[PDB]
Amino acid sequence: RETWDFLLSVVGFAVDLANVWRFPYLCYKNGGGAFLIPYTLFLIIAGMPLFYMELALGQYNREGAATVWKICPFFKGVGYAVILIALYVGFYYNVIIAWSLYYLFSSFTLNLPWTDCGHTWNSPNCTDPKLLNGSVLGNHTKYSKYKFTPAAEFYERGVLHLHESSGIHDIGLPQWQLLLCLMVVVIVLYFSLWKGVKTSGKVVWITATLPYFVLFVLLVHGVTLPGASNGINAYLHIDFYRLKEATVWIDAATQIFFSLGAGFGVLIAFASYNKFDNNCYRDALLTSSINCITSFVSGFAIFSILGYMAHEHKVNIEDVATEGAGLVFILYPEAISTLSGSTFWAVVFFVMLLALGLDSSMGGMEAVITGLADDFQVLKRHRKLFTFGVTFSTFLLALFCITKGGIYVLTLLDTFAAGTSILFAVLMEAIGVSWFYGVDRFSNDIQQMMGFRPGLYWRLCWKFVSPAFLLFVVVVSIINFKPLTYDDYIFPPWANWVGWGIALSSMVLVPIYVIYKFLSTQGSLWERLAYGITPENEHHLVAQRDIRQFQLQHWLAI
Amino acid sequence: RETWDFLLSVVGFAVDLANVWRFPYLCYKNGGGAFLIPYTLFLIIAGMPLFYMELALGQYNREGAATVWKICPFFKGVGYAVILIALYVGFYYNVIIAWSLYYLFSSFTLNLPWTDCGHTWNSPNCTDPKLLNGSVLGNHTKYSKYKFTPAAEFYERGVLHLHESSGIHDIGLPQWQLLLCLMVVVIVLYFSLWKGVKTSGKVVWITATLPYFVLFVLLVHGVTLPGASNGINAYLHIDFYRLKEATVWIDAATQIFFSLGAGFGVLIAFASYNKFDNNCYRDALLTSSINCITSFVSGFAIFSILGYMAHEHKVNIEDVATEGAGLVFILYPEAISTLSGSTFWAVVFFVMLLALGLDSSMGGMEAVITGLADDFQVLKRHRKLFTFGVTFSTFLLALFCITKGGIYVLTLLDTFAAGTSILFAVLMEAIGVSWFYGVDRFSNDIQQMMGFRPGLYWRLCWKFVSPAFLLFVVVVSIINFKPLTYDDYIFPPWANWVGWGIALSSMVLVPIYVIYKFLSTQGSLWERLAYGITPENEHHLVAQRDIRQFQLQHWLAI
Ligand SMILES: CCCCCCCCCC(=O)O[C@H](COC(=O)CCCCCCCC)COP(=O)(O)OC[C@@H](O)CO
Ligand SMILES: CCCCCCCCCC(=O)O[C@H](COC(=O)CCCCCCCC)COP(=O)(O)OC[C@@H](O)CO
Ligand SMILES: N#Cc1ccc2[nH]cc(CCCCN3CCN(c4ccc5oc(C(N)=O)cc5c4)CC3)c2c1
Ligand SMILES: N#Cc1ccc2[nH]cc(CCCCN3CCN(c4ccc5oc(C(N)=O)cc5c4)CC3)c2c1
Ligand SMILES: CC(C)CCC[C@@H](C)[C@H]1CC[C@H]2[C@@H]3CC=C4C[C@@H](O)CC[C@]4(C)[C@H]3CC[C@]12C
Ligand SMILES: CC(C)CCC[C@@H](C)[C@H]1CC[C@H]2[C@@H]3CC=C4C[C@@H](O)CC[C@]4(C)[C@H]3CC[C@]12C
Ligand SMILES: CC(C)CCC[C@@H](C)[C@H]1CC[C@H]2[C@@H]3CC=C4C[C@@H](O)CC[C@]4(C)[C@H]3CC[C@]12C
Ligand SMILES: CC(C)CCC[C@@H](C)[C@H]1CC[C@H]2[C@@H]3CC=C4C[C@@H](O)CC[C@]4(C)[C@H]3CC[C@]12C
Ligand SMILES: CC(C)CCC[C@@H](C)[C@H]1CC[C@H]2[C@@H]3CC=C4C[C@@H](O)CC[C@]4(C)[C@H]3CC[C@]12C
Ligand SMILES: CC(C)CCC[C@@H](C)[C@H]1CC[C@H]2[C@@H]3CC=C4C[C@@H](O)CC[C@]4(C)[C@H]3CC[C@]12C
Ligand SMILES: CC(C)CCC[C@@H](C)[C@H]1CC[C@H]2[C@@H]3CC=C4C[C@@H](O)CC[C@]4(C)[C@H]3CC[C@]12C
Ligand SMILES: CC(C)CCC[C@@H](C)[C@H]1CC[C@H]2[C@@H]3CC=C4C[C@@H](O)CC[C@]4(C)[C@H]3CC[C@]12C
Ligand SMILES: CC(C)CCC[C@@H](C)[C@H]1CC[C@H]2[C@@H]3CC=C4C[C@@H](O)CC[C@]4(C)[C@H]3CC[C@]12C
Ligand SMILES: CC(C)CCC[C@@H](C)[C@H]1CC[C@H]2[C@@H]3CC=C4C[C@@H](O)CC[C@]4(C)[C@H]3CC[C@]12C
Ligand SMILES: CC(C)CCC[C@@H](C)[C@H]1CC[C@H]2[C@@H]3CC=C4C[C@@H](O)CC[C@]4(C)[C@H]3CC[C@]12C
Ligand SMILES: CC(C)CCC[C@@H](C)[C@H]1CC[C@H]2[C@@H]3CC=C4C[C@@H](O)CC[C@]4(C)[C@H]3CC[C@]12C
Ligand SMILES: CC(C)CCC[C@@H](C)[C@H]1CC[C@H]2[C@@H]3CC=C4C[C@@H](O)CC[C@]4(C)[C@H]3CC[C@]12C
Ligand SMILES: CC(C)CCC[C@@H](C)[C@H]1CC[C@H]2[C@@H]3CC=C4C[C@@H](O)CC[C@]4(C)[C@H]3CC[C@]12C
Ligand SMILES: CC(C)CCC[C@@H](C)[C@H]1CC[C@H]2[C@@H]3CC=C4C[C@@H](O)CC[C@]4(C)[C@H]3CC[C@]12C
Ligand SMILES: CC(C)CCC[C@@H](C)[C@H]1CC[C@H]2[C@@H]3CC=C4C[C@@H](O)CC[C@]4(C)[C@H]3CC[C@]12C
């Protein structure tokens, strides 16, 4: 097996599409710091421990996301589910890239399209804050999401053409610009994964340095804006009534698992190609810290831009922009237009966005391919044809999201395909590793790898804290489910049913695989359970009947 | 390899769902005998020769629909395409079975639902021909498909609930009755195919004798009906202006390939499990003759019932009923209601219909499984799990057809997924067998199998007549494509585009596989072509450069 070298003090999981695209609007939806508090809370007790656990497991088992369950086959279906979940996000992650690519084609012009009105895609209700005599902002200002801004009009009508679709029931025909963009994206992804997984300097060298510089420049220019004070005050304000709710915690947990890459198989695949003596402890600590800092500064800049647009458009910060997946493509272009030499900064920004998106998609596809090739070794000899199959099936399923109303399907996937299912997957993983496999054996493996055992804090998190919190958030997501909306359009009940069915398609993979393993094994019921709970490399112990999982000392070991 | 025994003088391909369900409405659409003439024409020169060719190939190669191209790998993709085409019909063939199953649940009642009006599913516009004082048949009789008949109302509103769907753009939610029916159908199909392919007496013993008796009784009762004369005259009338058209020939060719099972891989799989000394000549002759006779008598009875309903409802025969896939479920129940003891005859009829449908679906699924297991031998050791995968994927894709507007998707599949693609597949097969592989080698194989060479007629058909006619019908289908309609609703252009894309998904499998084989082989371009045109068991000849396909004598051999 090959070993990846090209690894700075902080892995690439710190800066990704989740922190630059998902975290902004996920935080803007849940007020201000009222989303930051649960974010850091689930990061210190759930996110970082599960990150460390997945990294250590991938480094010790030297296997993919699915095969690492050779120590406990009854949870191997979990290794499938997360992979499918990864594929799920691949249905809309590549589309986002396409969006940036389109913005790239809009960045080479001397006059940015999102600067003013008067274009073909713009509607008659287009309010230019810079110069507009017909602007009656002082009046007829509906208390709702302001879509009559040049950036929002260019996003929904020029890029997505949402005005040609009434809802999810009538998506229409896929836009040909987005079609060609997605084709280019999947071609680039195929030409980067077919000949094995190389260092891929093209995207790594960028994502290592350029996103930090771009975020720094954006924050420095935003704090100097006239409306920065209101946005800063809104971002630093703590709304305890939102903490009293339940959706904020679910969103924080989902954003944690998105930014840290836990629950998709990317961490396991990454650790499988690392050195056996690599210290995942310091790596996980630095990754979590830098990811938290990056999310904090990204939300700070986002709220600064929101306050600026609120001061310019004379609208409330709550209703100045949207709360969907296209919030950054409306806020950041407006801030770039204010920058001197908007063309160069826009080009650099959308080039950064493309690099982060391609990096995330490449990591996800590599995780999926590694899992399915470790499960079926034949795919290791046909990686090119296999890579084509994944990228092509992905294109056929990403066509729904590039349609005239594909943003609704994208939101449906981001809310149901990822969410309330990844939490269950990571919960089952933690239960299988700490309780079924044993937290003591995991600590012994970590000691064999790095030379030292984790502290009691990590053990209590892997065994008690994180599983309990995951079960709690899963229960509170199931009992307190809320209807999905694009902040102006309420999804129909059958759309929610389809989303729940898509989530169950990955959730039920664990009991189905349990039943399959129970029926595929030969012997008594107790012998089948022993075969399903003992490692595949120690099945001879089942012949000796010395199964530690059938002893109370195993379950009472911390 | 196992060998099937349970084979009467005429194989089960004579009486099938195509002759009892597809042929009736396909002939009623194309006038009367104006559809019979091209049917027999394509049967004597295209249908029977290709039937004999596929039977002999399956009996000689002892392989599935795809692997029989071991003599010419460049056409092996064709063996895939037909299999996919089979799967295509499996998307709507099982649904038809479900329909009959629902009718079975409607057959145990003492009062048939399709006898009169006054039910929940019936609309206010329900005209009972038996007794109705409000019947003003003498007036307000729109010159269109009469849907205000009890049988049609029970079919479209009681079974399909078509009134709740405006078109293909809004299919709605799948009906739960049809859902349970399709679940029962796929369960029965899985429990009949998992433990290998047995004789399956349950459906074979029925389909051998019961359909003939039921058709005989129906014809005898129909010829005695008062309106039988008009229907007989319409069926025996030859409309030459329809022969001057092009759609009639396409429909006749599609019905021939449906009734004979050519173009789906069922014939190859059937012949692969037969004795090596089995005479496919007499079998093909008797099969074609009995299939033609069965189609003729079925159309005769159908036109008799149409004339009866025209006499009762006082409507023209052209507009007395529909021309869709639900014509038999409207005509035959009306004739059964006139029979003495309608309950028993209805039960026997829908039991026959279920047997034929299950037999056709079992043959198609067995062909698909045999092809995919001969291509990948590993599936021979996991036939149960594989059978589940085919049946389940089939259920997930048949859900579109059991919806409130699933009849539109069913018609789309029956018109595009099967049609203009199966003709291209059988054309490529005939070209690869007669020209690339060699008609002389095929005749030598038939002589080795049966002890005698086919006549010059069969050679000229396999090499000249049938390929030319297939190319002609393919060209006339491509250049003279007509928009699809349910005789009252015109499908939108994007529906036709999706249908053409589904057809191309199977059509382009041949050039894609050609490119794949060319790129996967190592050597010069001429050596790659030689490897792609010579049999896999004679590739050593490529080393000796004595390839007969590179000689003019091979192409000029009859
Ligand atoms: C909502 C429907 C789920 C139906 C799907 C239900 C079959 C259950 C078989 C099953 O669980 O066997 C697995 C292998 O599974 C696979 O292949 C890929 C399966 C991907 C299909 C999931 C599609 C979900 C939308 C595990 O097989 P294994 O025995 O652990 O290993 C096989 C071989 O690699 C050993 O080296
Ligand atoms: C509209 C998209 C077509 C994309 C699909 C394009 C790949 C092309 C590979 C290809 O053509 O390899 C085939 C094997 O193919 C398969 O697997 C099943 C393929 C089924 C996918 C078709 C889905 C169509 C809706 C033939 O492989 P082989 O080299 O002849 O034999 C493999 C092994 O069985 C040898 O014993
Ligand atoms: N879908 C999805 C999804 C969802 C939520 C997510 N959060 C985070 C992600 C993934 C983002 C990180 C991707 N990694 C993988 C690629 N990269 C890397 C570095 C050095 C290397 O070196 C070699 C070599 N020597 O071959 C190869 C090689 C590769 C580092 C970054 C994600 C993805
Ligand atoms: N999809 C589709 C589709 C489309 C268009 C079509 N036209 C025609 C068809 C198929 C209808 C015929 C199916 N055959 C296969 C099953 N049967 C049979 C007889 C004796 C046997 O004996 C054994 C044993 N000893 O194991 C096993 C066994 C099986 C004979 C009938 C079709 C299908
Ligand atoms: C089926 C699995 C294995 C692969 C595909 C998964 C995703 C891409 C599928 C699963 C269910 C699908 C949805 C099911 C139904 C609808 C409603 C329709 O009016 C628009 C498309 C839409 C919204 C589909 C979009 C694509 C979708 C979300
Ligand atoms: C079926 C899959 C595998 C391949 C085909 C994908 C389909 C969905 C895609 C591929 C190319 C696309 C077309 C490309 C360009 C145009 C022109 C535009 O003015 C209307 C939409 C239209 C007509 C698109 C419709 C959707 C389309 C046909
Ligand atoms: C429908 C469209 C998008 C299909 C893809 C078309 C383009 C992108 C394809 C068609 C043929 C392809 C080329 C075929 C062969 C090679 C040689 C290989 O060593 C590197 C890639 C390279 C150079 C490919 C690059 C991508 C390519 C140019
Ligand atoms: C165990 C290995 C070494 C040999 C056996 C190879 C077989 C079992 C492997 C290799 C190719 C694989 C398939 C490739 C493609 C698909 C389509 C999609 O639905 C994902 C799973 C599925 C259905 C895979 C299932 C497992 C598979 C059939
Ligand atoms: C969704 C549809 C349209 C496309 C599906 C593409 C994927 C799932 C399919 C298409 C062709 C398939 C490949 C065909 C043949 C082989 C060679 C065999 O030795 C291992 C499996 C492997 C490598 C298959 C893996 C799965 C595969 C890549
Ligand atoms: C619409 C989107 C999904 C189309 C994507 C097409 C991609 C996946 C296809 C189109 C043509 C293909 C190439 C055609 C030929 C070759 C040369 C061969 O020696 C290696 C593979 C390679 C380089 C193929 C790689 C995959 C490829 C680039
Ligand atoms: C083989 C699998 C992976 C393919 C999955 C993708 C298929 C099911 C998707 C991809 C894009 C989709 C199309 C996108 C847009 C339209 C136009 C709309 O007015 C009717 C539906 C139609 C025509 C869709 C039909 C289904 C479709 C072709
Ligand atoms: C998705 C629907 C069908 C729900 C049921 C899914 C699960 C429970 C079913 C579907 C198909 C089933 C498998 C079908 C056939 C076999 C082979 C047999 O030798 C052992 C049991 C085994 C391996 C079954 C185990 C259970 C199974 C995996
Ligand atoms: C994609 C392949 C491999 C498997 C599925 C094939 C069949 C079942 C698919 C392919 C394209 C599909 C159609 C694409 C688009 C539409 C329009 C939508 O308004 C209703 C469903 C409908 C009419 C789909 C029905 C199912 C369909 C016909
Ligand atoms: C996603 C696949 C694999 C499994 C689920 C299939 C879906 C499409 C099926 C399975 C069961 C179905 C439901 C069964 C019964 C009812 C009640 C009826 O009054 C309205 C429709 C409704 C609510 C159906 C909607 C469609 C449904 C949810
Ligand atoms: C969602 C529904 C339709 C799933 C299927 C449920 C029913 C039909 C399933 C569930 C469990 C199944 C049984 C499980 C095991 C066996 C033993 C085997 O030797 C014969 C079949 C038999 C007896 C199965 C028959 C079908 C069965 C009863
Ligand atoms: C050559 C044999 C002996 C060993 C290799 C087994 C592999 C290559 C076989 C066995 C299982 C197969 C897959 C099973 C399921 C699917 C899903 C569907 O899209 C049809 C093809 C596809 C994708 C098959 C492709 C080929 C496959 C992956
Ligand atoms: C469409 C989706 C929902 C379901 C797809 C089901 C089919 C394509 C998949 C699901 C599970 C798969 C099987 C999983 C594992 C094995 C064992 C391996 O040694 C040969 C292939 C085989 C037997 C696979 C064949 C293809 C398979 C049956
Ligand atoms: C909605 C439809 C598709 C559901 C169909 C479910 C079918 C395919 C599933 C459900 C439960 C399954 C059964 C569960 C358990 C067993 C016992 C095992 O020893 C052999 C397989 C067998 C008998 C399975 C066969 C397949 C099965 C019957
Ligand atoms: C994995 C593959 C084989 C699955 C293919 C089947 C999927 C794509 C089909 C089967 C039945 C379909 C559903 C049937 C009916 C409805 C209700 C409608 O108002 C919106 C779309 C929706 C919710 C469909 C979504 C797509 C669907 C779930
Ligand atoms: C469906 C779209 C992508 C159109 C292109 C399809 C065909 C022409 C493409 C798609 C993927 C391609 C394959 C991808 C990778 C390889 C492996 C390489 O060692 C030989 C060529 C081969 C086997 C390619 C042959 C051409 C190929 C099969």
Kindly write down the DSSP assignment for every residue of B99-123, as one continuous string: HHHHHHHTTSSSS-GGGSS-SSSS-
- Report CB contact under 8 Å: A169, B173: no
Angle at A490 between CA A485 and CA A495, to 5 degrees: 85
What is the b/e burial string over A250-280, where b = at least 16 CB atoms within 10 angstroms of the residue's CB? bbbbbbbbbbbbbbbbbbbbbbbbbeeebbb
Which residues in chain B are contacts of A170 at CB distance < 8 A? 169
- Report CB contact under 8 Å: A494, B173: yes
* Alpha-helical runs (H) found in B399-492: 406-412, 422-431, 439-450, 456-460, 466-479
What whole-number distance in Å separates Cα of residue A155 and Cα of residue A377?
A: 44
Q: Count the Cβ atoms, other than its own, within 10 Å of residue A430.
A: 26
| Ligand 11 atom having least distance to the Cα of B492 | 19
Decide: A225 and A339 in contact? Cβ < 8 Å: no
Cβ of residue B169 closer than 8 Å to a chain A Cβ: yes
Question: Which residues, judged by CB distance below 6 Å to any ligand atom, belong to the binding site of ligand 5?
Answer: A 91, 168-169, 171, 397, 400, 409, 498, 502
Decide: B415 and B407 in contact? Cβ < 8 Å: no
For chain B, the residues before each gap (C–N > 2.5 Å) are 4
**Which of B84, B376, B381 has most ligand 16 atoms within 8 Å of its beta carbon, as the pocket-test mutant?**
B376
3-class DSSP assignment, residue B403: strand
Annotated binding site of B for (R)-noradrenaline: 16, 28-29, 86, 90, 258, 323
What is the b/e burial string over A196-226, where b = at least 16 CB atoms within 10 angstroms of the residue's CB? ebeebeebbebbbebbbebbebbbebbeebe
* A109: amino acid identity, one letter: T
Binding site membership of A456 for ligand 8 (Cβ less than 6 Å): no
Show the domains of chain B with their CATH numbers. Answer: 17-520 (1.20.1740)
Q: Which residue minimizes the CA distance to atom 3 of ligand 19?
A: B393
Q: How far is the CA of B502 from the centre of ligand 20 (A)?
A: 20
Decide: A475 and A481 in contact? Cβ < 8 Å: no
The closest CB to that of A173, out of B169, B170, B494, belongs to: B494
Cβ of residue A494 closer than 8 Å to a chain B Cβ: yes
DSSP classification of residue B167: B
| Ligand 15 atom having least distance to the Cα of B183 | 3
A167 beta partners: A170
Q: How far is the CA of A193 from the centre of ligand 3 (A)?
A: 12
Which residues in chain A are contacts of B381 at CB distance < 8 A? none
Cβ of residue A170 closer than 8 Å to a chain B Cβ: yes
What is the Cβ-side half-sphere exposure of residue B98, based on CA atoms within 13 angstroms? 30
How many helices (H) and strands (E) chain B has is answered by 26, 0
Nearest ligand to the CA atom of B492: 11
Q: Count the Cβ atoms, other than its own, within 10 Å of residue B457.
A: 11
What whole-number distance in Å separates Cα of residue A175 and Cα of residue A182?
A: 10
Q: How far is the CA of A393 from the centre of ligand 13 (A)?
A: 15
Question: Which residues, judged by CB distance below 6 Å to any ligand atom, belong to the binding site of ligand 1?
Answer: A 76, 375-376, 505, 512-513, 516
Q: How far is the CA of A389 from the centre of ligand 8 (A)?
A: 11
Cβ of residue B515 closer than 8 Å to a chain A Cβ: no
Binding site membership of B180 for ligand 4 (Cβ less than 6 Å): no
What whole-number distance in Å separates Cα of residue A181 and Cα of residue A188?
A: 11
Q: Which residue minimizes the CA distance to atom 5 of ligand 20?
A: B512
Question: Which residues, judged by CB distance below 6 Å to any ligand atom, belong to the binding site of ligand 7?
Answer: A 183, 187
Decide: A361 and A88 in contact? Cβ < 8 Å: no
Q: Which residue minimizes the CA distance to atom 2 of ligand 13?
A: B502
Structure's resolution in angstroms: 2.4
Q: What are phi and psi of A85, to 5 degrees?
A: -55, -45
Cβ burial of B9 (10 Å; 0-12, 13-18, 19+) is exposed
Nearest ligand to the CA atom of B408: 13
Distance of CA B323 to the CA centre of its chain: 17
In Å, how far is A101's CA from the nearest CA of chain B? 27
User: Cα dist. B416→A4, B19, B79, B412, B442 in Å?
Assistant: 49, 19, 19, 6, 32
Distance of CA A468 to the CA centre of its chain: 22
What whole-number distance in Å separates Cα of residue A374 and Cα of residue A63?
A: 7
B170 beta partners: B167
Distance of CA B264 to the CA centre of its chain: 9
Handedness of CA B433, B434, B440, B445 (dihedral sign): positive
Minimal CA–CA distance to B215: which of B69, B14, B58, B79? B14
In Å, how far is A172's CA from the nearest CA of chain B? 9
Length of chain A: 558
Is residue A301 annotated as involved in ligand binding?
no
As a three-state string, the secondary structure of A226-276 is: CCHHHHHHHHHCCCHHHHHCCHHHHHHHHHHHHHCCCCCCHHHHHHHCCCC
* B501: amino acid identity, one letter: G
Q: Count the Cβ atoms, other than its own, within 10 Å of residue B152.
A: 23
The closest CB to that of B169, out of A170, A173, A494, belongs to: A170
What is the Cβ-side half-sphere exposure of residue B322, based on CA atoms within 13 angstroms? 24
Decide: B54 and B513 in contact? Cβ < 8 Å: no
| Ligand 20 atom having least distance to the Cα of A194 | 15
Nearest ligand to the CA atom of A405: 5
Cβ burial of B249 (10 Å; 0-12, 13-18, 19+) is buried
| Ligand 5 atom having least distance to the Cα of A408 | 23
Provide the experimental method for this PDB entry. cryo-EM
User: Cα dist. B34→B237, B245, B249, B254, B475 in Å?
Assistant: 8, 10, 9, 15, 21
- The CB-based long-range contact list for A539-547 (8 Å cut-off, 24+ gap) reads none
**Taking CB atoms and an 8 Å cut-off, how many pairs form between chains A and B?**
4
In Å, how far is B279's CA from the nearest CA of chain A? 41
Q: Count the Cβ atoms, other than its own, within 10 Å of residue A139.
A: 5
What whole-number distance in Å separates Cα of residue A233 and Cα of residue A33?
A: 10
As a three-state string, the secondary structure of B143-160 is: CCCCCCCHHHHHHHHHHC
What whole-number distance in Å separates Cα of residue B170 and Cα of residue A169?
A: 8
Cβ of residue A105 closer than 8 Å to a chain B Cβ: no
Cβ partners under 8 Å of residue A136, min gap 6 = none
User: Cα dist. A358→A514, B231, B342 in Å?
Assistant: 35, 67, 67
**Which of B186, B379, B388, B392 has most ligand 12 atoms within 8 Å of its beta carbon, as the pocket-test mutant?**
B388
The DSSP secondary structure of A491-508, one letter per residue, reads PPHHHHHHHHHHHHHHHT
Q: What are phi and psi of A277, to 5 degrees?
A: -90, 10
Beta strands in B62-104 (DSSP E): none
| Ligand 10 atom having least distance to the Cα of A395 | 3
Which residues in chain A are contacts of B396 at CB distance < 8 A? none
| Ligand 16 atom having least distance to the Cα of B386 | 14
What whole-number distance in Å separates Cα of residue A330 and Cα of residue A323?
A: 11
What whole-number distance in Å separates Cα of residue A13 and Cα of residue A19?
A: 10
User: Cα dist. A429→A363, A436, A513 in Å?
Assistant: 20, 10, 14
Nearest residue on chain B to A497, alpha-carbon basis? B173
- Element of type H or E holding A211: helix A201-223
User: To which residue do tokens 């963009």 refer?
Assistant: A181
Is residue A319 annotated as involved in ligand binding?
no
Question: Which residues, judged by CB distance below 6 Å to any ligand atom, belong to the binding site of ligand 3?
Answer: A 4-7, 12-13, 16, 18, 86, 89-90, 93, 197-200, 204, 258, 261, 264, 266, 270, 359-364
Is residue A487 annotated as involved in ligand binding?
no
Which residues in chain A are contacts of B170 at CB distance < 8 A? 169
Distance of CA B426 to the CA centre of its chain: 14
| Ligand 5 atom having least distance to the Cα of A409 | 23
- Report CB contact under 8 Å: B169, A173: no
* Alpha-helical runs (H) found in A115-200: 150-153, 176-193
- Element of type H or E holding B28: helix B23-29
- Element of type H or E holding A518: helix A509-520
In Å, how far is A173's CA from the nearest CA of chain B? 8
Q: Which residue minimizes the CA distance to atom 9 of ligand 9?
A: A389
Give chain A's largest Cα–Cα span. Answer: 88
Q: Which residue minimizes the CA distance to atom 5 of ligand 17?
A: B389
